[PDB]
Structure formats: C-alpha cells, structure tokens
Design a protein around this motif. Structure first.
Motif, PDB file in Angstrom:
ATOM      1  N   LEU A  23       0.750  -1.383  -0.087  1.00 16.39           N
ATOM      2  CA  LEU A  23       0.107   0.030  -0.176  1.00 16.39           C
ATOM      3  C   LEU A  23       0.973   1.209  -0.122  1.00 16.39           C
ATOM      4  O   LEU A  23       1.930   1.312   0.724  1.00 16.39           O
ATOM      5  CB  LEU A  23      -0.885  -0.044   1.251  1.00 16.39           C
ATOM      6  CG  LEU A  23      -2.271  -0.683   1.426  1.00 16.39           C
ATOM      7  CD1 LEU A  23      -2.071  -2.134   1.030  1.00 16.39           C
ATOM      8  CD2 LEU A  23      -2.571  -0.586   2.798  1.00 16.39           C
ATOM      9  N   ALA A  24       0.515   2.286  -0.767  1.00 11.56           N
ATOM     10  CA  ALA A  24       1.238   3.341  -0.672  1.00 11.56           C
ATOM     11  C   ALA A  24       0.272   4.497  -1.277  1.00 11.56           C
ATOM     12  O   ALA A  24      -0.210   4.041  -2.310  1.00 11.56           O
ATOM     13  CB  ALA A  24       2.469   3.486  -1.555  1.00 11.56           C
ATOM     14  N   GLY A  25       0.449   5.436  -0.522  1.00 11.66           N
ATOM     15  CA  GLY A  25      -0.636   6.648  -0.941  1.00 11.66           C
ATOM     16  C   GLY A  25      -1.956   6.756   0.165  1.00 11.66           C
ATOM     17  O   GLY A  25      -2.582   5.827   0.276  1.00 11.66           O
ATOM     18  N   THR A  26      -1.898   7.888   0.839  1.00 14.97           N
ATOM     19  CA  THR A  26      -2.849   7.817   2.107  1.00 14.97           C
ATOM     20  C   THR A  26      -3.749   9.253   1.948  1.00 14.97           C
ATOM     21  O   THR A  26      -3.284  10.293   1.826  1.00 14.97           O
ATOM     22  CB  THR A  26      -1.972   8.019   3.117  1.00 14.97           C
ATOM     23  OG1 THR A  26      -1.104   6.781   3.464  1.00 14.97           O
ATOM     24  CG2 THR A  26      -2.741   8.262   4.621  1.00 14.97           C
ATOM     25  N   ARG A  27      -4.925   8.856   2.039  1.00 12.79           N
ATOM     26  CA  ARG A  27      -6.161   9.793   2.699  1.00 12.79           C
ATOM     27  C   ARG A  27      -6.457   9.491   3.951  1.00 12.79           C
ATOM     28  O   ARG A  27      -6.685   8.172   4.323  1.00 12.79           O
ATOM     29  CB  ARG A  27      -7.002   9.802   1.501  1.00 12.79           C
ATOM     30  CG  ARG A  27      -6.709  10.839   0.485  1.00 12.79           C
ATOM     31  CD  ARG A  27      -6.213  12.224   1.058  1.00 12.79           C
ATOM     32  NE  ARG A  27      -5.786  13.205  -0.304  1.00 12.79           N
ATOM     33  CZ  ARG A  27      -4.567  13.119  -0.590  1.00 12.79           C
ATOM     34  NH1 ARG A  27      -3.570  12.285  -0.030  1.00 12.79           N
ATOM     35  NH2 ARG A  27      -4.348  13.928  -1.578  1.00 12.79           N
ATOM     36  N   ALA A  28      -7.023  10.463   4.626  1.00  8.84           N
ATOM     37  CA  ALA A  28      -8.027  10.404   5.669  1.00  8.84           C
ATOM     38  C   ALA A  28      -9.350   9.549   5.439  1.00  8.84           C
ATOM     39  O   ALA A  28      -9.682   9.801   4.206  1.00  8.84           O
ATOM     40  CB  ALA A  28      -8.337  11.770   6.624  1.00  8.84           C
ATOM     41  N   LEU A  29      -9.910   8.635   6.479  1.00 11.38           N
ATOM     42  CA  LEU A  29     -11.016   7.930   6.350  1.00 11.38           C
ATOM     43  C   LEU A  29     -11.819   8.059   7.600  1.00 11.38           C
ATOM     44  O   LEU A  29     -10.964   8.317   8.688  1.00 11.38           O
ATOM     45  CB  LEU A  29     -10.804   6.427   5.730  1.00 11.38           C
ATOM     46  CG  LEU A  29     -11.985   5.734   5.494  1.00 11.38           C
ATOM     47  CD1 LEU A  29     -12.748   6.049   4.096  1.00 11.38           C
ATOM     48  CD2 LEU A  29     -11.686   4.118   5.145  1.00 11.38           C
ATOM     49  N   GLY A  30     -12.866   7.903   7.839  1.00  8.57           N
ATOM     50  CA  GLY A  30     -13.591   7.770   9.016  1.00  8.57           C
ATOM     51  C   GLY A  30     -14.157   9.092   9.550  1.00  8.57           C
ATOM     52  O   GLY A  30     -14.757   9.210  10.752  1.00  8.57           O
TER      53      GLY A  30
END
Ligand SMILES: C/C=C(\Oc1cccc(C(=O)O)c1O)C(=O)O
Length: 435
Positions: free
Chosen positions: A254-261
């Motif tokens: 996995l690579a690349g991150t957004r906020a969730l929740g």
C-alpha cells in the motif's frame, strides 16, 4: 481436534479475545492470537520457543535452553529452527523485528549485541474461533473447563476508553523529518518513513482494548499477544508476505494515504482525490515496481505478476492505494528467503531500500523491534503468513507506548508529517481501555 458451535449474538473477535483474557489468565500462560481470513487463531501456551538474536539463536523447551552460534542469512537460521518446531506441531506463531531486515542491505554491523530479530513458538493448544464455530486442538481438561466457564458466563461489556494526548513531540520528530527532507534534496534517497513513539501514562487492558479497536478498524490481519514479557496488539493494514503450501507467494504493498472515518461525504471526495492524484499515484507506482523487483529474487522465472493494481483499500482512520503482487516460489528458494526478499516492507522503510533503512538507523529511535516488522504464522505444510506491524500498542516492563510514522519525500513538511502521524495514531488512541 473437536469442535463447538458458535453462540448466537457473539462476534468471533470478541470471543477470541475474551478467551485469550480469561483462559490464559487462569493458567498464567503466554499466547498469541492471530486473525487471518475470518479465523481467529489463539495459540495458547509455549511448548517450545525459538529466540533469534543478532549474536545468537536459542531454543527453549521444558526449562532447557539450547544455545547456538549462527552466521549467514538470518532467514536461514530462523528457517532451520522453525522447520524443526513444525515436525512436532502443525503451526508456529511469533513476531519478526524490523531489524531482521537489515542484513540483506549490509547493515548487520550496526546492530548491538543481543538485538532481537525474531521470536517464534509452538503453542501447547490452539483454539480457532470463526463465525460458525470454535475448534480446539490439543486443549487439556483445565483449558476445556475454563473455556466452558467463559461460554457459560459470556463476554464482558467493554468499558469506556481513556484518552491520551498525542500532540506533544518529545523525540523531535519535526526536527528529524527536516533532516530527512535535506538529505532527500541532496539526492541521498527518494523516500524514508520516520516515526515517533507516544507514551501511554496508564496501564491498558490489552484484550479489551483489542476488542474496542477492532470495531473501528478493517484490517487484513490483527493480533493480540503476551509473549516473553511483551504485550502487544495491532491492526495490520497489509500483508508483507504470504507463502501457500502450493508455492504461491503474495505481497500486498500500500502506498498513498487519505483520511477516512470522517463521514461518507468527506470520505468520498478524499477517495476521488486519492485515485486521481499525481503525487499519490507516483509513489504507489514506485512501490509496486520495488516490490516486483524484490519478489523476482525468489520467483520462478516469469511468474511475477501484479494481480490487483492501484485500487482503494479501506483501513479505519485512513484509506490507501493498494496492489497485490504474486509469484511462484522458485524451487531453489524457501519461505524465509521470500520473507527476507520483501523485508523490511517498502511501506515502512524507504526507497532505495539500502539507503532508506540506513537513514532509519540515524534518524529514528532504534531498534524498532516489533514496530514495522511482522507478526507471523507458519504451517507444517510450508505456509507463511506475515502481517506488517503498524497501528499497534506495546507494553514492556512498566512502559506502555504507541508508535506511528509517515513517508517523507522531497516535498514533505514537518508540520503536515506530524499531523499524518496523529491521523495514524487515531486508529487506536480513541480506543484504549485502562486496566
Ligand atoms: C499501510 C500504508 C501506509 O500506512 C503507514 C505507513 C508507514 C507507517 C505507518 C504507521 O502507522 O506508523 C502507516 O500506517 C501509508 O502511509 O502508505
């Protein structure tokens, strides 16, 4: 092996963790609980223990310690010992330190004497808890009785959690990130993941904490353990290596991150951003290519393939871009050679790996130990399942801490990187149940 049907309104995560609590308490034994594809496998009690350190290999069974010197690759030493454990029992469990991955990049000389690389045990008993049933492998009367008692009384209600402030920076994460950014600007490497520990000023209840955090995380694997004086739990966002008995190997970067929740409306626009964002896409593409090159070192010629490319993976407090890479294990290789090829994970080390891992020795608190290493389950038929250790809490001695990190590239800013480690700690900081 016998079997018991699963009670009606009861989640197998809550049951398996209650079992770990109540049962293993009553008999006062070490254990590791590993969640792998809807099965919660409780490995209870230590029949025998392999301890691999930087300077020594020990096997401990029934009070007796056999000590050995070892040279060569750490996976060869570990592999031999675990292979022997697996003559006796069908599965072995444990953890592998970040440090196990440094030999391959020429850094063995930096490890201090007695640096832990791996701990792998055979259990005395396994209890497997799924949606449908509880299976028991070699449970004695005293265990069967305590399980009976647990089923009779039911799972405890999880109390309200106690909160922790993560917004301090005592280890100078901000200062450290800035050093990495300068080094990247001078062309020293492309990317490194730095981290920070956060102290938890009260003792936590590991099984109840595990239960609470599990309702807010969607992991690929998860774990709850008490082993040799370490307590730990975590929600693993990625498989670093799985090897099947039929020789199929998988890795899942996995690579690349957004906020969730943050609620559906916010989490949709972050996803659409994620999937079309040049900066996130480039870094995913780069990791895919590194992990393909790693897997090619253990792969039957031409068998390495990306089978799932760059799709959104949902992980609780964050969503990520993920791919799955597959190969056939070469007959000249073995499962431990596959794990060393893919360790430490690209996701939690850096690119190029030799320079990135080395920057971690200088710019992070070392040794990392469990953090960014793996929790593992191994099978007599040749299986290996290795979950990347992140989003975990640990207790060793009288110290309880969390740890989280973030990928630093040329354009990174210390403040925003710190905020990223907050978001990552958030996947656990709201769910700590005080002891
Ligand atoms: C699983 C993929 C990611 O997550 C992490 C990367 C590095 C460190 C961490 C951490 O939690 O310390 C993390 O969650 C990512 O940031 O690319």
């Amino acid at each position: 092996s016998s079997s018991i049907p699963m009670p009606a309104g009861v989640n197998p995560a809550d049951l398996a963790a209650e079992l770990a609590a109540v049962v293993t308490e009553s008999v006062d034994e070490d254990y590791l609980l590993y969640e792998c594809d809807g099965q919660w496998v409780l490995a209870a009690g230590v029949q025998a223990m392999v301890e691999l350190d930087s300077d020594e290999l020990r096997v401990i069974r029934d009070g007796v310690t056999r000590r050995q010197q070892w040279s060569g690759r750490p996976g060869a030493a570990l592999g031999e010992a675990v292979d022997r454990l697996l003559l006796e029992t069908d599965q072995a469990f444990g953890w592998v330190a970040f440090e196990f991955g440094v030999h391959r990049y020429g850094l063995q000389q930096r490890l201090a004497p007695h640096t832990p690389l791996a701990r792998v045990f055979s259990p005395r008993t396994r209890i497997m808890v799924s949606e449908k049933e509880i299976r028991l492998f070699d449970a004695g009367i005293r265990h069967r009785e305590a399980i009976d008692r647990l089923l009779a009384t039911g799972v405890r209600e999880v109390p309200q959690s106690r909160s922790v402030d993560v917004s301090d920076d005592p280890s100078g994460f901000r200062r450290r990130v800035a050093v990495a950014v300068d080094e990247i600007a001078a062309g020293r490497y492309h990317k490194v993941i730095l981290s920070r520990c956060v102290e938890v000023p009260f003792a936590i209840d590991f099984p109840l904490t595990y239960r609470l955090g599990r309702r807010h995380n969607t992991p690929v694997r998860s774990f709850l353990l008490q082993l040799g004086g370490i307590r730990a739990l975590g929600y693993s966002p990625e498989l670093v290596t799985a090897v099947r008995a039929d020789g199929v190997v998988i890795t899942e970067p996995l690579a690349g991150t957004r906020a969730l929740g943050r609620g559906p409306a916010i989490d949709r626009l972050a996803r659409d951003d994620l999937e079309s964002n040049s900066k996130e896409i480039v870094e995913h593409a780069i990791s895919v290519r590194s992990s393909l090159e790693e897997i090619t070192d253990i792969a039957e010629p031409g068998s390495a393939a990306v089978i799932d490319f760059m799709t959104v993976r949902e992980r609780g407090s964050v969503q990520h871009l993920g791919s799955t890479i597959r190969a056939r294990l070469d007959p000249s290789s073995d499962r431990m050679a596959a794990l060393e090829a893919l360790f430490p994970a690209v996701t939690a080390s850096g690119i190029p790996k030799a320079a990135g891992v080395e920057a971690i020795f200088r710019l992070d608190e070392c040794p990392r130990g469990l953090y960014s290493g793996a929790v593992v389950m191994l099978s007599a038929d040749g299986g290996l399942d290795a979950a990347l250790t992140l989003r975990a809490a640990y207790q060793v001695g009288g110290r309880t801490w969390l740890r989280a990190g973030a990928g630093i590239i040329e354009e990174s800013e210390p403040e925003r990187e710190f905020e990223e480690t907050c978001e990552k700690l958030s996947t656990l900081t709201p769910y700590l149940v005080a002891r």
